[PDB]
Amino acid sequence: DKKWLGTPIEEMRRMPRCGIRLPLLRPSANHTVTIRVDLLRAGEVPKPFPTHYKDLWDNKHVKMPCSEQNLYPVTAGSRWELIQTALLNKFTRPQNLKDAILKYNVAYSKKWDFTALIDFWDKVLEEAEAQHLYQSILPDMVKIALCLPNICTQPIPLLAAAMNHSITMSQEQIASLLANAFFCTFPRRNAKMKSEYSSYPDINFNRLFEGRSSRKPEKLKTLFCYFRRVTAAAPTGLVTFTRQSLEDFPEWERCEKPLTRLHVTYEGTIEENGQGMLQVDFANRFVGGGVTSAGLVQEEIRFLINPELIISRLFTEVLDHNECLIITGTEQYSEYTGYAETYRWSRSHEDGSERDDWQRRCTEIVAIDALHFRRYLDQFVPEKMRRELNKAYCGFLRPGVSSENLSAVATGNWGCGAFGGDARLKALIQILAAAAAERDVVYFTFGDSELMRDIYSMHIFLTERKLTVGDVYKLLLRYYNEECRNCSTPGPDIKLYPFIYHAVESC
Numbered sequence: 001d002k003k004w005l006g007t008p009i010e011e012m013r014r015m016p017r018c019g020i021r022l023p024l025l026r027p028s029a030n031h032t033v034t035i036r037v038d039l040l041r042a043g044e045v046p047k048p049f050p051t052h053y054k055d056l057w058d059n060k061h062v063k064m065p066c067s068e069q070n071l072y073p074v075t076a077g078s079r080w081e082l083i084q085t086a087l088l089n090k091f092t093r094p095q096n097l098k099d100a101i102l103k104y105n106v107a108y109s110k111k112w113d114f115t116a117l118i119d120f121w122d123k124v125l126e127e128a129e130a131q132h133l134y135q136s137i138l139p140d141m142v143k144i145a146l147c148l149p150n151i152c153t154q155p156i157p158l159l160a161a162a163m164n165h166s167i168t169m170s171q172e173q174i175a176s177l178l179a180n181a182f183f184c185t186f187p188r189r190n191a192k193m194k195s196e197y198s199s200y201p202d203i204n205f206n207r208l209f210e211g212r213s214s215r216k217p218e219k220l221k222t223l224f225c226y227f228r229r230v231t232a233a234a235p236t237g238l239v240t241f242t243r244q245s246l247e248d249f250p251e252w253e254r255c256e257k258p259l260t261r262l263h264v265t266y267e268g269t270i271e272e273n274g275q276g277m278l279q280v281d282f283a284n285r286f287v288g289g290g291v292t293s294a295g296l297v298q299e300e301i302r303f304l305i306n307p308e309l310i311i312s313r314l315f316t317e318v319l320d321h322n323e324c325l326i327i328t329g330t331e332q333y334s335e336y337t338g339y340a341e342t343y344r345w346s347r348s349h350e351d352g353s354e355r356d357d358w359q360r361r362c363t364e365i366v367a368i369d370a371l372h373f374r375r376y377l378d379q380f381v382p383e384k385m386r387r388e389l390n391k392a393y394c395g396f397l398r399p400g401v402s403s404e405n406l407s408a409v410a411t412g413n414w415g416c417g418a419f420g421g422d423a424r425l426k427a428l429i430q431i432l433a434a435a436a437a438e439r440d441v442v443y444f445t446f447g448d449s450e451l452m453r454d455i456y457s458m459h460i461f462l463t464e465r466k467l468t469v470g471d472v473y474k475l476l477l478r479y480y481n482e483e484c485r486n487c488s489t490p491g492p493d494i495k496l497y498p499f500i501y502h503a504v505e506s507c
């Protein structure tokens with residue numbers, strides 16, 4: 001029983017080795033660069049551009065906590081002056097941190113529960129660990145949070161619905177903003193009945209502090225490992241956030257492109273074994289899912305080990321069906337064990353990834369949200385199948401870039417879990433989208449040895465028969481018509497892979 005099947009992993013494409021020498025990094029109408037490109041040097045902390053803080057308090061930019069327009073009725077008082085007074089206090093007990101956060105969040109003093117913060121500090125941490133948190137970590141986090149106007153000098157545009165826009169900022173700038181999110185300083189991001197930011201994920205970390213879930217200390221340890229690292233020694237690299245939407249989608253039934261190569265394995269992970277590859281994040285439409293709340297599956301774990309991903313929540317609007325978010329340069333700060341209810345923070349991780357010409361770690365992650373199916377048979381509906389293909393296609397396609405400069409896609413069981421996705425159908429959908437996007441697939445089954453063989457055998461059968469993307473999509477439509485459309489039973493009589501084998505072998 002082989003641990004992997006198909007094309008050997010060495011024959012696949014990886015970054016930055018398959019990376020077409022980056023053009024000169026520069027701001028444009030579609031690219032926001034928040035640092036001095038001319039002064040960008042390996043191992044040096046980037047210099048913010050502009051030199052002095054410029055504010056934009058409008059419908060198109062992040063509303064900064066340090067904005068002179070961040071005011072509260074007291075007569076208008078400065079909310080930033082208030083944050084400074086509240087946070088520049090000695091913390092010696094968890095109650096001190098809760099009281100400080102709530103001084104500039106009065107309206108939420110009875111709505112925000114801090115049980116997990118109090119229990120982490122008092123009931124989980126040993127005395128010396130609790131001592132290091134309040135004497136060192138927390139004050140260092142306060143100073144970087146309060147440094148926001150000197151660090152994040154340029155207004156950050158919102159990556160709104162249908163925008164094809166990028167933001168390149170420093171990891172230092174991300175650390176100042178994530179320190180602010182921890183202290184819940186972002187204004188207009190808290191109300192349940194909020195309109196302006198209703199289509200945006202939560203950014204402030206208040207939900208990380210609530211309840212008695214045994215996974216809250218693991219999240220907090222994962223997060224404090226990051227905060228300790230970035231306050232102790234300023235990170236030097238950059239990170240790019242790109243919102244992508246495609247105007248024209250393929251006419252799937254008509255696609256003459258052949259299938260690409262497949263490496264399928266029941267061992268390994270996307271982060272370790274998918275180095276230099278386009279790494280899929282099985283995302284929630286509000287990027288990050290329950291990272292700073294309850295969730296702790298594939299997406300939340302990635303956002304906890306690479307905390308720079310979380311900041312996407314500050315500016316990324318809920319993804320529409322034709323959109324994805326591409327994040328390049330996030331660094332891995334933690335190692336972990338388990339998954340979901342068994343997830344535990346292990347130790348600090350020293351990211352060995354090389355950096356590209358823009359000082360970005362050579363780690364490309366794409367957030368693509370699968371559909372949630374109320375009923376199992378819903379996913380076989382042609383509209384639902386086309387949607388999934390178009391989602392993954394937009395996530396894999398790199399407009400302008402040629403086939404030979406495209407790394408393999410590092411993926412697995414996308415949308416299969418609480419979302420009700422069928423692993424075998426989703427594997428074929430990603431295989432077809434990668435084929436149309438002219439990329440090979442590296443598929444991780446995470447201990448599921450039978451699924452590895454099933455995907456492999458089906459990929460090799462269609463490949464050997466020279467079945468195009470169109471031919472395979474036409475078989476999916478026949479499956480729906482024959483087995484799903486007029487089926488009143490919760491499940492079909494025959495499964496998808498046996499239908500395909502029969503349909504082809506009888507043709």
Ligand SMILES: CC(C)(C)NS(=O)(=O)c1ccc2c(c1)C(=O)c1ccccc1C2=O
Pocket residue numbers: 268269270271297298299301302305338339412444446
């Ligand atoms: C989570 C991330 C993005 C940091 N890495 S990863 O490569 O995507 C991955 C590693 C391990 C597992 C899974 C995914 C997974 O989905 C899973 C599902 C059901 C049971 C166990 C696991 C599991 O251990």
